[PDB]
Amino acid sequence: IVGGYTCGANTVPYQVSLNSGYHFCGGSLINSQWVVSAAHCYKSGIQVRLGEDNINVVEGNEQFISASKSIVHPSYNSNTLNNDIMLIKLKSAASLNSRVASISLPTSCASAGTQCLISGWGNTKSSGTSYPDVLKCLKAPILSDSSCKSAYPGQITSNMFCAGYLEGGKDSCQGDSGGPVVCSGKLQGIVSWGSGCAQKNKPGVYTKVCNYVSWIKQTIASN
Ligand SMILES: [Ca+2]
């Protein structure tokens, strides 16, 4: 997260870190057994780390649970990033309390102008590289479809939305991939892609979670 703030420990209780020997992506806990992330975050051998603040220090609220299964969206296209969503099942149920909690799925899509909270452990620099140990947060609005398409001609599908600031300086970034965009207590987006980070006229692009609620529910019900 570039141009954000330190969230505070366990203030974003649905945020997970996906670990394969190291943090590589975010995700969102949606029930005791299941995490939503980006399909571009797919790999084998994932350990889900819940209750994290400093990802390099054991601080006392962590739950580390290996994944039993990953399900990439049936129509994910890794070239275009259309349908950039994946579900991960935990081998055992997380213990839920106020520091580790699921986030609700949307019942309606969010509109441009809605304020959201984007979070993660990704790069905090727009030029060059610095990875935080503690969770970072950014408040940002959803942008209009027309501004999003104008920013990224030929690239924005109906399964994507832009959020952030056209002036630059405030965005998600590498290492935030897969993490949440939460608006009014609902998971509306997944950190998906963008051109660089925090660049002028190049806002973040996010998977439009509301389009996937049916798929998520049916997949959970049968897996
Ligand atoms: Ca920790």
Curated annotation (Swiss-Prot):
GO terms for biological process: digestion; proteolysis. GO terms for molecular function: endopeptidase activity; metal ion binding; serine-type endopeptidase activity; serpin family protein binding. It is an enzyme of class 3 (hydrolase). The keyword Acyltransferase does not apply. Disulfide bonds join 7-137, 25-41, 109-210, 116-183, 148-162, 173-197. It catalyses: Preferential cleavage: Arg-|-Xaa, Lys-|-Xaa. Interacts with SERPINA1. InterPro entries: Peptidase_S1_PA, Peptidase_S1_PA_chymotrypsin, Peptidase_S1A, Serine_Proteases_S1, Trypsin_dom, TRYPSIN_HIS, TRYPSIN_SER. It is found in: Secreted, Extracellular space. Synthesized in the acinar cells of the pancreas. It comes from Bos taurus (Bovine). It holds the Pfam family Trypsin. Subsequent cleavage after Lys-125 leads to alpha-trypsin. Further cleavage after Lys-170 yields pseudotrypsin. A cleavage may also occur after Arg-99. Not sulfated on tyrosine residue(s). The active site is at residues 40, 84, 177. Is inhibited by scorpion cyclotide trypsin inhibitor TopI1. This is Serine protease 1. Binds 1 Ca(2+) ion per subunit. Residues 1-221 form the Peptidase S1 domain. Belongs to the peptidase S1 family. Substrate binds at residues 171-172, 174-175, 177. Its EC number is 3.4.21.4. It comes from the Eukaryota. Its main location: secreted. Ca(2+) binds at residues 52, 54, 57, 62.
